[PDB]
Amino acid sequence: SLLQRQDLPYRFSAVDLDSVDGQRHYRLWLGRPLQAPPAAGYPVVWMLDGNAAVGALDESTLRRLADGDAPLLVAIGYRTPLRIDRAGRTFDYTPASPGQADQRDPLNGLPSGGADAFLDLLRDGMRPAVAAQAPLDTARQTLWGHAYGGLLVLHALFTRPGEFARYAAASPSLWWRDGAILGERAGLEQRLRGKRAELLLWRGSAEPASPREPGQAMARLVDDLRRVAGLTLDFQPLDGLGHGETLGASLRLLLARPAVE
Numbered sequence: 001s002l003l004q005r006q007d008l009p010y011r012f013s014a015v016d017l018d019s020v021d022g023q024r025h026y027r028l029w030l031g032r033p034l035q036a037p038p039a040a041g042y043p044v045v046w047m048l049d050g051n052a053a054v055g056a057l058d059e060s061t062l063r064r065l066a067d068g069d070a071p072l073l074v075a076i077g078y079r080t081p082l083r084i085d086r087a088g089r090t091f092d093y094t095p096a097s098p099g100q101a102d103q104r105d106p107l108n109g110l111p112s113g114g115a116d117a118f119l120d121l122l123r124d125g126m127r128p129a130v131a132a133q134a135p136l137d138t139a140r141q142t143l144w145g146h147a148y149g150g151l152l153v154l155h156a157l158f159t160r161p162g163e164f165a166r167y168a169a170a171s172p173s174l175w176w177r178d179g180a181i182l183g184e185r186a187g188l189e190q191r192l193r194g195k196r197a198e199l200l201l202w203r204g205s206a207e208p209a210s211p212r213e214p215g216q217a218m219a220r221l222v223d224d225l226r227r228v229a230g231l232t233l234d235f236q237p238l239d240g241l242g243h244g245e246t247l248g249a250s251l252r253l254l255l256a257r258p259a260v261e
């Protein structure tokens, strides 16, 4: 319903692209404020699982976002009949395992390891297409994701910091490949030299540790990252919520934060 609606201070339009290999099909939903852009361009919020993200963007949030410094919203979705692509997101949101050649997801068995190709496409194809539709302030960009989307967000921050000002990971799948993402954090302070980033983290109080000790891995990660120079960290636990529900909750709360400086 939201994408057709005409009563909000945002208008949504679609920008379509394929992956470089031709196997995955994207539709970016662009939400542009009626408000004129600042001289330096709109700040930008990029959202993974874009078809689900659009379903969570409520009217009250969107009215308040039009506050004189409203962001451009870019929801990166799959352009499929079903409006999901389990294979596509499994490949696009997971890092490669240097260990071996068996790049298959340990849970669902589908090909994995496409995170760097996905982030390269965002940089080299998606942003070019979005910037042609609306002026962007490239110093004021946010990347948000939930679950495997949050895994991709942490991969981006940990291995290629500086592409975004603010990283936002909701219920990231820290269990993935027995904690492999936690290894990628080693070396971050060196990679952040001369740069600044903000990381927002959420987890629901009712979530298990994995889909098959709850909270422990996140608590350890938070404790570690609080020590990292150049990184501003904000962890928000979500009392009363389980795994599915932290998607909408995190996005509402993100969009209520002060805009990136």
Ligand SMILES: O=C(N[C@@H](CO)C(=O)O)c1cccc(O)c1O
Pocket (backbone or CB within 6 Å): 107, 146, 147, 148, 149, 173, 207, 208, 209, 210, 211, 243
């Ligand atoms: O990370 C989870 N699921 C992912 C699929 O592997 C996802 O991306 O949601 C996950 C975590 C805790 C509990 C769950 O039921 C769950 O699906």
Ligand SMILES: [Fe+3]
Pocket (backbone or CB within 6 Å): 211, 243
């Ligand atoms: Fe689950």
